[PDB]
């Protein structure tokens, strides 16, 4: 039935969802069908969306080159 766990949600183009700020990838979330979304500064690589409890069905970070 229903699964969900929350990780760094990615754009489906191999890349981390680049978010002006916690406003953008909070809505931006709940587009694709997550409760909610929060910026977090991981490194000086640019911010990332992070979304709760997201879907499998939804993309995410994977292991590999981000163009």
Request: one cysteine or more; hydrophobic letters at 25%.
């Amino acid at each position: 039935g229903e699964e969900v766990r929350d990780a760094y949600i990615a754009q489906p183009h191999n890349c981390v969802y680049h978010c002006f700020r916690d406003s953008y990838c909070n809505d931006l979330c709940i587009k694709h069908g997550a409760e909610s979304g929060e910026c977090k500064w991981f490194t000086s690589s640019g911010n990332a969306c992070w979304c709760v409890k997201l879907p499998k069905s939804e993309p995410i970070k994977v292991p590999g080159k981000c163009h």
